[PDB]
Amino acid sequence: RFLYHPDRKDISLPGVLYALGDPARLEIVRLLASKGEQCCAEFDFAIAKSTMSNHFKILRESGVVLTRKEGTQHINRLRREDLETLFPGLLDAVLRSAQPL
Amino acid sequence: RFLYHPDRKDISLPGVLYALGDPARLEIVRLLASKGEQCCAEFDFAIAKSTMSNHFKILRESGVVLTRKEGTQHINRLRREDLETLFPGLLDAVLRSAQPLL
Numbered sequence: 072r073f074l075y076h077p078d079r080k081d082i083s084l085p086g087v088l089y090a091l092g093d094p095a096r097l098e099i100v101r102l103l104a105s106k107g108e109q110c111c112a113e114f115d116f117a118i119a120k121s122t123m124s125n126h127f128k129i130l131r132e133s134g135v136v137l138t139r140k141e142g143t144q145h146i147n148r149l150r151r152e153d154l155e156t157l158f159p160g161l162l163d164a165v166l167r168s169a170q171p172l
Numbered sequence: 173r174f175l176y177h178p179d180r181k182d183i184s185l186p187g188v189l190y191a192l193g194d195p196a197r198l199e200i201v202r203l204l205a206s207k208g209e210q211c212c213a214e215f216d217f218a219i220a221k222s223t224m225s226n227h228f229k230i231l232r233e234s235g236v237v238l239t240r241k242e243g244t245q246h247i248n249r250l251r252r253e254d255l256e257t258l259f260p261g262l263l264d265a266v267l268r269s270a271q272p273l274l
């Protein structure tokens with residue numbers, strides 16, 4: 072079922088901003104807010120699977136993405152309820168100027 | 173006289189977020205936004221000056237901070253117009269959610 076996720080007390084703005092500080096990690100967050108839950112395979116970035124796995128590990132450890140294992144799929148979800156509880160209005164400002172890749 | 177700064181055409185939102193993705197780098201920006209132009213010496217948020225020299229380097233090359241040499245002093249300026257013309261409402265959104273560390 073659910074993969075590792077930090078608690079809300081352990082989420083910082085420097086970690087969220089670090090996880091959004093990559094072209095791929097930001098497109099993952101842009102698509103997870105516009106298209107809802109998505110499996111890791113829908114992200115067809117032309118990058119190695121070692122870099123993609125680390126990207127999702129950063130997304131999870133930062134408090135931004137909640138990943139779940141249902142079958143053989145890795146389902147990711149934007150933890151927007153928790154990010155708007157700590158930082159109200161931040162995700163919207165980042166997604167305003169986020170240009171689609 | 174004026175250290176490297178990227179043109180507004182080459183500043184990306186991911187690069188700006190990576191430069192605010194450090195508690196020390198975010199503290200520098202929050203001080204440059206509240207108290208104005210500050211010198212690198214007014215920020216001792218590290219045991220190593222190499223760690224601090226790399227912080228301003230990331231802030232400079234990412235398009236957030238402009239640094240200028242005035243004698244024995246490097247003065248740092250927040251590029252507010254550039255970050256607000258490209259990313260409207262982002263810096264104020266980041267600054268209002270930042271916890272003061274000073």
Ligand SMILES: [Cl-]
Binds near residue numbers: 118119
């Ligand atoms: Cl390859």
Ligand SMILES: [Cl-]
Binds near residue numbers: 110143
């Ligand atoms: Cl998958």
Ligand SMILES: [Cl-]
């Ligand atoms: Cl001169």
Ligand SMILES: [Cl-]
Binds near residue numbers: 211212244245246247
């Ligand atoms: Cl100085």
